[PDB]
Design a protein around this nucleic acid. Sequence first.
RNA 1: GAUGUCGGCUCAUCACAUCCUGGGGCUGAAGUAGGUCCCAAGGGUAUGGCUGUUCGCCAUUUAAAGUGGUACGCGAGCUGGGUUUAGAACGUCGUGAGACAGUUCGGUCCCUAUCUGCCGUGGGCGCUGGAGAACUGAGGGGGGCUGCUCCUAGUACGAGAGGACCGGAGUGGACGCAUCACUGGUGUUCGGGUUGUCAUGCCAAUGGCACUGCCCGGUAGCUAAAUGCGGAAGAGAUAAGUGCUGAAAGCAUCUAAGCACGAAACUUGCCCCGAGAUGAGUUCUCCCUGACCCUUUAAGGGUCCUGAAGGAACGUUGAAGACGACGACGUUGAUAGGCCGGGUGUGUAAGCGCAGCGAUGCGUUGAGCUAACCGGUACUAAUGAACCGUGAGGCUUAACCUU
RNA 2: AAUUCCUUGUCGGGUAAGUUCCGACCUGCACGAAUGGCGUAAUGAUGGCCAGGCUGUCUCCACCCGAGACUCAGUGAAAUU
RNA 3: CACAGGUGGUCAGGUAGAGAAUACCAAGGCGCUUGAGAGAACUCGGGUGAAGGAACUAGGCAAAAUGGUGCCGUAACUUC
RNA 4: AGGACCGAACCGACUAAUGUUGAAAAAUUAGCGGAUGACUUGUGGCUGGGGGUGAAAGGCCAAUCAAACCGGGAGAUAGCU
RNA 5: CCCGGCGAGGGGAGUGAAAAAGAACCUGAAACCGUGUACGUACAAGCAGUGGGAGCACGCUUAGGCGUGUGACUGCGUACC
Lengths: 123, 209, 56, 127, 114
Amino acid sequence: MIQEQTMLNVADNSGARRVMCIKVLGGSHRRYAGVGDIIKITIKEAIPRGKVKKGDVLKAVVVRTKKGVRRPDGSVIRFDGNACVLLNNNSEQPIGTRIFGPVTRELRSEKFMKIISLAPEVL
Amino acid sequence: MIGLVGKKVGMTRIFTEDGVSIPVTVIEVEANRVTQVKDLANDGYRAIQVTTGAKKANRVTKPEAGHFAKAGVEAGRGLWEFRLAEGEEFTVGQSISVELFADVKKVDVTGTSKGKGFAGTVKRWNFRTQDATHGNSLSHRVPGSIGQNQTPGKVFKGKKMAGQMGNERVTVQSLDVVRVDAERNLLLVKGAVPGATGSDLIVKPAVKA
Amino acid sequence: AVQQNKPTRSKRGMRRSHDALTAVTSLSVDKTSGEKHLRHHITADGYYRGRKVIAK
Amino acid sequence: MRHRKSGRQLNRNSSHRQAMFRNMAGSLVRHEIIKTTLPKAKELRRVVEPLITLAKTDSVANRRLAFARTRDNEIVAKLFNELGPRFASRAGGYTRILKCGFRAGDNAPMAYIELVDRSEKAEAAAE
Amino acid sequence: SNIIKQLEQEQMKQDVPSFRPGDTVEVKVWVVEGSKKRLQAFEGVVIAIRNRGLHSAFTVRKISNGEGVERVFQTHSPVVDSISVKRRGAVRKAKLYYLRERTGKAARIKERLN
RNA sequence: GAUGUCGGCUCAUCACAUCCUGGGGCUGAAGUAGGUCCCAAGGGUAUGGCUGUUCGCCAUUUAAAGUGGUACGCGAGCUGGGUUUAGAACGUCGUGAGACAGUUCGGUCCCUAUCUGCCGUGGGCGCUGGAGAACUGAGGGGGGCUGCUCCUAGUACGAGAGGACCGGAGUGGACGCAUCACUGGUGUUCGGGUUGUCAUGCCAAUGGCACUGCCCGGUAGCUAAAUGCGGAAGAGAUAAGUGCUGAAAGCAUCUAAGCACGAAACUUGCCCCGAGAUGAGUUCUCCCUGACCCUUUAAGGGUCCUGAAGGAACGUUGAAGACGACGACGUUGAUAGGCCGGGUGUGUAAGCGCAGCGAUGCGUUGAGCUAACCGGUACUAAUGAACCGUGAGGCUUAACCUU
RNA sequence: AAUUCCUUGUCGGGUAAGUUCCGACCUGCACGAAUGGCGUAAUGAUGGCCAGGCUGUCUCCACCCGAGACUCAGUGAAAUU
RNA sequence: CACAGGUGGUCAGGUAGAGAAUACCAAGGCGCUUGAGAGAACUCGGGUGAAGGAACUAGGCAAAAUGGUGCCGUAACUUC
RNA sequence: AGGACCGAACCGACUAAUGUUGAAAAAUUAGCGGAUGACUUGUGGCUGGGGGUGAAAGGCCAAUCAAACCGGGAGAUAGCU
RNA sequence: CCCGGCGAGGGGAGUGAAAAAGAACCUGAAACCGUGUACGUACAAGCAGUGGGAGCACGCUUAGGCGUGUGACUGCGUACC
């Protein structure tokens, strides 16, 4: 993410364990992310019997940071860890369907409303 | 019309009716007493001379004092003068304050001595902190090299490296005023603006088109 | 890193034109003190603007 | 960097800075008068005046609090008996800088430091 | 005696609660998305001092989830819909910093009287 | 008398034969996309791995993955893995000592800058009477990159699928700039906790010390991981080229004469440094009208009286900054400290009462204590002078005063 | 291979990797049975490889504190020439 | 050299701790002589660090991190 | 009991950070190792330069080592700068 | 006889032919750092020298481009072994 190599958490109902940043998207001539950034992930780990398996090269976007995500009111949303939601790289959007923890409301679109099942926050 | 000398005094994250809050610097705009004014027989260009803000006139010199005496007297800290930008003033005072940035919502701002001392290395120049482990010794922050060989025969002009730096300017240019707010005489400019906190500045409006 | 030839005495004197040693650049005549008045500073008997304020 | 902030950072780390100021303020309340270098007399002034403000009344509870603030039997003894009533009526300005001259042997500007209202002197030359 | 820094209090939106550490709150807010009529709430503990200026905020920890989350709500913008202060527990500190990236404890831990 | 090497990194820079957008010709190019192709140095021009390796192999970025140079750039830069690697051993060879443009393992890498450059900054003197003040531009760089999609636009063209540029719009990335409210960091001039021992005769409490003992909060500043933001309408000189009108060559033909048009580059505009620019500067404002003695006299030398406007030391000190210069400014004062209201911190002051075996809680007490900030408050220290500047300051043409 | 001209060997495996590491293969440089070989517990400040604590080495660097530099005072060298 | 270097014998006080680790400390020794100011680059020492966790480098690289005491619980291999 | 151990004191110095015109002719701090032994080490003793001495690097012999230093040969020779 | 510690160092007064013989004393260079005067340096720059030389002090300018010392400025120009 902010550094090359760097393992961070799966944030889908597709995968398990950890996955590894190879590059950032949404620009070049950098080797660091910001906040509300677009990642390039390779899967390091995850179960082969789920939709996510070792060494699929995919696109992904940030859903948590332990630095925390912000833009409109500048007021952060911080979490227990750095985490990133996988895209399909061919059809995009969240490849998984639930998770128990929430999304950042400061960087908020279709890609964060398709990845949870809490009724009192927008679906 | 003119460059209006404010003070850096306050900075605020302000709310808007978009759902966004905008980080800002808040500048006290004062009233304007115009002074002697130079016409276009004088130095060749039509400009307006202004005193915005003042001091206790215990330190004043008579040669500045005659300017204020023949026009609106205000026992000024100094003289600032301006080539036109939107227009001009009444030649003794037009009591201008927040009004100046209501016909333009864009500022250019003038280059001021930036109040960061040296700033310089690792702050506006392309140096880093170089490796410190694997027996790297006496070389931790200095570039190590800057030129090449007898080929150029010397150091290039495009390369630059200085232990220290004196008064340095360069503006942000062309940046939007977010608001001006009447009855408190407040000029809100977005985020960055040349100067430390508690600095003076000159604020000119738009010069570019 | 070193030299190439022995310096001339013109060299030494010009280099010092703006790097030699400086002091308190005189003091004023007195009015009120037991000593002679240090310019715009209090004396050791204290009387500058009034009384023995300094005693050390 | 040092910008839009005032006062003097001295040439001591913190444990050293405390231990010299603990000596100095005990000399300062006891003699009413001290001489030291001008950057150092200004920090000496700003340290001793908040202690005097807590100490301006003769009241027992502010004498117990003042012994909680500094474990010194000499500071808490001069105040609340001789010096209490001396500073009782003021609401700031419990000390003064007198710009004594330059120090001896060097061209470092010096001050004599002196409480706003005095009850004691020592007045041999600075050594 | 307060003539400037006064002008900020003249600008501030009237919505701000007066505060001491360890309130419970429910912060009523928007899903934001620019500006949107879909609302939602968050309740838990305020982990930090709200006094900041024209830019006061509620530093909630929602303490409900299984990893937790900290959310910061801007008091002076229309994102914050209404704010009720509820009862003050005990903290015996001002800011409970160990919760900014970890889940934990309530607005009350013991008692915080004289 | 040798300049100290590879690979990688620091740090770059210059030649354009341009990686790319941009203007333009052709196509065996239908339109579109390409190939072809001139013009053009301005700007942007990515990163991990295994190995001591360049190259290798592999994954990825961006619209994009360039050309060429630098004592095989740069060791009076970095490492020091490797090298004949000096030890050793492997692989090899000799009787051996000992050897390798074969190999592998850790292992020193020096120098305060004389002259020379690069960036920043000051002192001395002339700015023509002085002094202070505003100020113009001879001259030189920075931004100059570049995606996305809506409309433009299903239209020219085609057999059908299909099918463009600019312009208008919001918006991302780098590069450059400034900033500290927001969000993180720190905050040795601030509060509180806490392990241990030593102390205040003792208790309760508190403080010295162990890296500020350790720990967490923290005003104000600064700061990038956060913030705001340039990338410009217009002006001219063009390139290649599209031309007109038209010759060499009765015509034909950007071109040869002539004249319309013709790009981020170029001279600029926008920004920023700039009068020593002897091409010595313009323009505003202010102020000095006493005297005698002597010599080289557009003039200087001495002396009485006498030095204005202003300056400088000096003083506290800065939001200006290595030092200066620059600046606030000295009782006319918010310069710096206290102190108080506040933008604004912390966590419940020592003692005493009460419940309890007590730690501790609870009532006393939403307590007590507090730094830089913003505004106040003179509460506290910046005396009064002397001093550097003098009594109206060139020749000569043009303008004006008789002139 | 502490060895391999070619070769980053051929092939499986971990992986963004994969010269090294683990497993197998041999088109085997010049490996090869006292220059000794296979195999092994424990040990070396020993060599390589792997994943996790943790960490400013770095990504990308900020701020605080002190001693030189720099400030004020004192004394006052040198590589060289 | 007032120099941080090296050097054997005898004697053996406290608290907390596994101990001659280690904080402070009794008796005792003793301030290793620039100083003071500022808070530019930078050089060394010391404090602190978001998100990551070596990704920097031939190489994890000191400092940071690990440590102690009661009790549960404990692998391949083995010369048991 | 033990050329045993985790680990001091006591002694060293594989590696890191520094020093590298140093405080010190490799010491400091820190990872690190021996300590009932082939240790650590005082006192006293003993070998002299192509000669000693080496759990072996031609290592070490006055913080030194393919050969110390000094008096004679000696104005070695220098084909060379 | 003067300054100062009780010091370091010198002067003046007086001695002698001589103290420009003052105790390290013989007369006395050059390197070596500073003073004093003359003249030169604020539009300017390369082996630092020569060629031409404003000027200024001094020389009845020898009145005759000049003499002594210096030198704005500038032609031209690469140390010695």
